[PDB]
RNA sequence: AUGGUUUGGCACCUCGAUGUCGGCUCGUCGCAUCCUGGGGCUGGAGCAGGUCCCAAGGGUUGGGCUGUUCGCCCAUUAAAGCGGCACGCGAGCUGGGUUUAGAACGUCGUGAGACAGUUCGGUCUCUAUCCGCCGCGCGCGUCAGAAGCUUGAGGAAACCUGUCCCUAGUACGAGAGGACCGGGACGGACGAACCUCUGGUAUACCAGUUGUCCCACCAGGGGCACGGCUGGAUAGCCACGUUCGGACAGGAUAACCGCUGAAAGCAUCUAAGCGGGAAACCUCUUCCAAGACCAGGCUUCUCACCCUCUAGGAGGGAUAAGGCCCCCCGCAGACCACGGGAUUGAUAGACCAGACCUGGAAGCCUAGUAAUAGGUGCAGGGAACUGGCACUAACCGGCCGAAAACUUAC
């Protein structure tokens, strides 16, 4: 359960190491995002030779959470931190490289490449 | 529109075909007997009546024994009434018949109805939903009231103010039958009815679907 | 326990025994575009809730730097077969404080 | 036992727990004493199991009575006669008895006892 | 806040008609052989003799 | 021309007191409509708008700055409406601003001092009489006394919406772009019920452990230290959890589109008529409801016995069906009420067994110098859940509680 003002870290390459949950797309007064959820984040951390710098306004989905999300056959995911990979606005990574493992929530919500790019999916 | 009388058992676990979980309420849809029927040329409308649950005969006051002798068929503990729309509908009871748990098929949708758990004397916070005040920045001992009441200076009717809760009667409407275990009478609905364990419901076919 | 007569219909035998610490590896059946796989799932088992048909087991495996912990229903259907490795040694029902250990500290002690 | 649904006895658990063995004590050591209604129906299952474990007298059992009874005499009577006077009945052990309200509050008064027959 | 008006007489007595005391029954018990009455709630403890009769 | 939502003007109202701004909590109303709904012309090709009529059912976000309203900005959204109600709401809250006494700066004054200039600090009282409103009982009434099951006049609640997939990359369009109508799935917010799952709580549960005192001592335990502190924790309550809901269909309509045609030999959706037409209205869904005084209906049970005054009516007593009190209780509960049981009994407690929680009791033996470890042994301990079991308590018991007749018609 992310929402506004929550720190993710980026399981990306792209230089950003922390970003700060703006708003949860997906609807007007929605609170929570989950696992395959798209949020508007700013950087808080960056890597000093990036691309990316301090404060940019991107767009990241969250593919590990915390709190423990239900599945469909009764099963439960629970990760030991809450991170996300930034995309571009045709939902793919703007890194090459995804570090760590996703949920399979990745897959129903149509990012294929994030999905392939990861390590693996749970 | 079928009927039938039936108890709340509990809640538990199933899966379906594909493999996912089903969270089913069990009720025992017990067999029910018919004692009366309402007609529109004698009580200007059209029901059927049903007896369920088993009683002892020194139990029942005479009246009661009057009636069910008066109907033929040996008392129960619960009687209820089952309100159909027109006489080519009620044709098809008559009295003494049996009904059972078969008159409903798997996937079939239902609307059980039930009387909800007590909660006693609630607050507005519990009693309607209301958001709370502060509790800190100086908030002096309303961290749970209701405020503010709102030029005829009179509380209109109506007021969501705090007061008893629970015990009222509660449909809940497309509840899916996930499956009709004819050999106890009991059926799997999926999804939570209302009440306590050991309460009497009553399941109809859905107006709706 | 008043439905166990609904209970047994659905209950699945041919589980193997197994207690809170041991290490075991879950074959779970995934759908991956419409085809059937068995992903191996390897961990310590640090928790088992029981209740019957609900009963739940906790499996925590540590992979690629980050800890994983996954709850399965005891008798899913979901789960084709359970291998139990090694049999742990522990002095509780419950391994919580492992959430909080890594490497050299998480290790168990075997029976 | 069953927990008490509302607020606890003497005003604390603390207190509750401290009222309960000494009322125990008494009882054991007398054989009847007389308190208000809610105490003699707060005492019934607790020196009923009191003396379930007396029944079945081993050193276990015998430490199980002692963490609560604290009185040695007590514990005694209880493994000696009150146990083997036991043996062959199976729960009921004590009975209550209503009596003539208290003058001082009103209080609703009751006799708890073991049974002899 | 405090009473603006001085109650009417009709009013007080109307609720005051209110706190009234309800009459225990009674029923009859042989102790010592003369008859007596006792509320059922002490019959037990009468015919047990654990409750002074004056 | 409207309105008294803006500053006004009057001083009719209060100086033997009518709280002054914002904010929080909770509303209610208007429509001069922000979204959703129905329309029309387009300087409308389609998309999308422009503008305008009907339409008030529901909805109308979270933050930064400021005491702020206002306002600007940041992200969204279907949308981030305008107003009335003492510019709603301090015997409901706040005290940041304004509006006492302290102190300073700038300016004015010789000075005490002053400034619809600034700056820091600065007591917000009350046991609810009446109306109102939310809940709950007692009495009486409904033409004998009761008991089941109900009809419903009449009210209350609810009414939101997005994305994606097929139709269709077609209509239109130089192309780009881009459909109508109709089906399906998954969502956001809101609401209700529930506790199988997840998660929270746990003051009579299990285990570990610190300090100290006690149980003569060892062992084993106990009291106190926030339940001493920690690790877990079934039931109940709950949400962060589960499941369900907003409908479909009909009727009369708004803007509007029409059909059949007069006055007015043609024409005219019209003055006669007849049709279509919206989240608004009536039904439809859920709930309350015969104190609905027109006090309803269908049934079933009791369906009788005295005494007194004076025989007119009344009064008193004892009963039936039934009810209440006392009693055992409840997941029912402030009290009351409600629901169940009452020996022809499983209502509660105990006892036995199971489920579940904890995690390997005591004693003994073995190994070790000892801390400690292994065996006996899924051990011992234990609440709520389930099934048995009259062992204990529901008792040799009290109080209430049933008919004037007449008129007409059949």
Redesign the interface.
Do not use: I
């Given at each position: 359960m992310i929402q506004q003002e929550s720190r993710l870290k980026v399981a990306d390459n792209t230089g950003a190491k922390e970003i700060l949950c703006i708003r949860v797309l997906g609807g007007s007064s929605r609170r929570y995002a989950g696992i395959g959820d798209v949020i508007v984040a700013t950087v808080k951390d960056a890597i000093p030779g990036g691309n990316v710098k301090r404060g940019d306004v991107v767009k990241a989905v969250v593919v590990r959470t915390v709190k423990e999300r239900r599945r469909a056959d009764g099963s439960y995911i629970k990760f030991d931190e809450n991170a996300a990979v930034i995309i571009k606005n045709d939902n793919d990574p703007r890194g090459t490289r995804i570090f760590g493992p996703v949920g399979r929530e990745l897959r129903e919500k149509k990012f294929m490449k994030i999905v392939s790019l990861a390590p693996e999916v749970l | 529109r079928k009927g039938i009388l039936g108890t709340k058992?509990?809640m538990?676990?199933?899966?379906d075909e594909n493999?996912?979980?089903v969270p089913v309420t069990?009720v025992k849809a017990g067999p029910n007997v018919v004692t009366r029927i309402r007609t529109t040329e004698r009580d200007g409308y059209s029901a059927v009546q049903l007896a369920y649950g088993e009683i002892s005969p020194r139990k029942v006051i005479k009246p009661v024994a009057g009636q069910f002798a008066a109907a033929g068929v040996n008392p129960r503990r619960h009687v209820a009434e089952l309100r159909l729309d027109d006489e080519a509908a009620v044709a098809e009871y008559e009295v003494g018949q049996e009904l059972t748990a078969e008159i409903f098929s798997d996937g079939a949708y239902v609307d059980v109805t039930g009387t909800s758990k007590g909660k006693g004397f609630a607050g507005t916070m519990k009693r309607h939903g209301f958001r709370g005040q502060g509790a800190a920045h100086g908030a002096q001992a309303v961290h749970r009231r209701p405020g503010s009441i709102g030029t005829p200076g009179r509380v209109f009717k109506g007021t969501r103010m705090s007061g008893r809760m629970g015990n009222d009667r509660v449909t809940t409407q497309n509840l899916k039958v996930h499956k009709v275990?004819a050999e106890?009478g009991?059926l799997?609905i999926k999804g939570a009815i209302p009440g306590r364990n050991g309460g009497l419901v009553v399941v109809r076919s859905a107006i709706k679907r | 326990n008043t439905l166990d007569f609904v209970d047994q219909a659905s209950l699945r035998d041919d589980i193997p025994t197994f207690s809170p610490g041991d290490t075991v590896n879950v074959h779970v059946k995934v759908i991956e575009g419409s085809k059937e796989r068995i992903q191996v799932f390897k961990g310590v088992v640090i928790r088992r809730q029981g209740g019957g048909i609900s009963e739940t087991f906790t499996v925590r495996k540590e992979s690629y730097g980050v800890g994983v912990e996954r709850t399965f229903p005891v008798h899913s259907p979901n789960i084709d077969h359970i291998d139990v490795l090694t049999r742990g040694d522990v002095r509780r029902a419950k391994l919580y404080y492992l959430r909080e250990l890594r490497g050299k500290k998480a290790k168990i002690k075997e029976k | 036992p069953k927990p008490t649904k509302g607020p606890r006895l003497g005003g604390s658990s603390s207190h509750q727990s401290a009222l309960l063995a000494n009322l125990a004590t008494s009882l054991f050591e007398h054989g009847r004493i007389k308190t208000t209604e809610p105490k003699a129906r707060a005492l019934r299952p607790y020196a009923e199991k009191l003396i379930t474990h007396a029944k079945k007298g081993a050193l276990h059992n015998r430490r199980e009575v002692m963490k609560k009874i604290r009185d040695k005499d007590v514990v005694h009577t209880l493994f000696a006669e009150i146990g083997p006077f036991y043996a062959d009945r199976n729960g009921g052990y004590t009975r209550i008895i209503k009596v003539e309200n208290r003058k001082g509050d009103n209080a609703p008064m009751a006799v708890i006892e073991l049974v002899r027959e | 806040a405090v009473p603006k008006r001085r109650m009417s007489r009709a009013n007080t007595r109307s609720r005051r008609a209110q706190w009234k005391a309800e009459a225990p029954g009674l029923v009859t018990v042989s102790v010592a052989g003369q008859q007596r009455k006792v509320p059922r709630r002490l019959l037990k403890a009468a015919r047990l003799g654990l409750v002074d009769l004056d």
């Open positions: - | 058992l509990g538990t676990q199933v899966f493999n996912k979980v069990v275990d106890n009991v799997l | - | - | -």
